[PDB]
Design a protein around this ligand. Structure first.
Ligand SMILES: CNC(=O)c1cccc2cc[nH]c12
Ligand SMILES: [Cl-]
Ligand SMILES: [Cl-]
Ligand SMILES: [Cl-]
Length: 163
């Protein structure tokens, strides 16, 4: 475990992370996809061997010895707000199981269902709070990765409001 488990946020490409494993915002079919998923495909393409997994689950595939945790959030274009909320919470609970099983001391993680799968709604708070519910009982250092400058400030605020 980490000596003093922490949350941090960085505004940069998750393919450049400084952590012991990465969470992909995957699609259910193991396709290269777009956004985060395509960045992860360019950096760790070997990790897409038999990475297909259902919505609300996570599947780990090693790229060398580097673990890529493929976490499949719901596409809110297709799910009701109610069912999508349940599947988004479930994906993050499966990420916490995988991070624990792997024995890593740090993990890089994007906010699931906040981009192309957001159904055109701002889900920063919803996705981050499900991230915290899952990861708070883990002892890995968690480093959240984002792109937007306003999102960086809001995620940083949310982390510090708990400390
Ligand atoms: C944390 N987010 C990202 O890393 C990300 C998001 C969207 C597109 C690209 C391309 C490279 N990285 C991306
Ligand atoms: Cl960057
Ligand atoms: Cl997304
Ligand atoms: Cl962002």
């Amino acid at each position: 475990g980490a000596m003093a488990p922490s949350y941090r946020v960085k505004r940069m490409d998750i393919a450049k992370n400084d952590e012991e494993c990465v969470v992909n915002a995957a699609n259910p079919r193991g396709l290269p996809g777009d956004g985060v998923c395509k960045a992860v495909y360019k950096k760790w393409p070997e990790s897409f061997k038999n990475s297909a997994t259902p919505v609300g689950t996570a599947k780990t595939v090693m790229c060398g010895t580097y673990p890529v945790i493929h976490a499949v959030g719901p596409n809110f274009s297709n799910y009701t707000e109610s069912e999508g909320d349940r599947e988004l919470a479930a994906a993050y609970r499966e990420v916490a199981k995988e991070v624990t099983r792997l024995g890593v001391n740090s993990v890089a993680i994007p906010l699931l269902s906040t981009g192309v799968y957001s159904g055109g709604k701002d889900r920063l708070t919803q996705s981050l709070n499900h991230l915290f519910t899952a990861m708070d009982s883990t002892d890995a250092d968690v480093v959240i990765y984002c792109r937007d400058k306003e999102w960086e400030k809001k995620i940083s605020e949310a982390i510090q409001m708990r400390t």
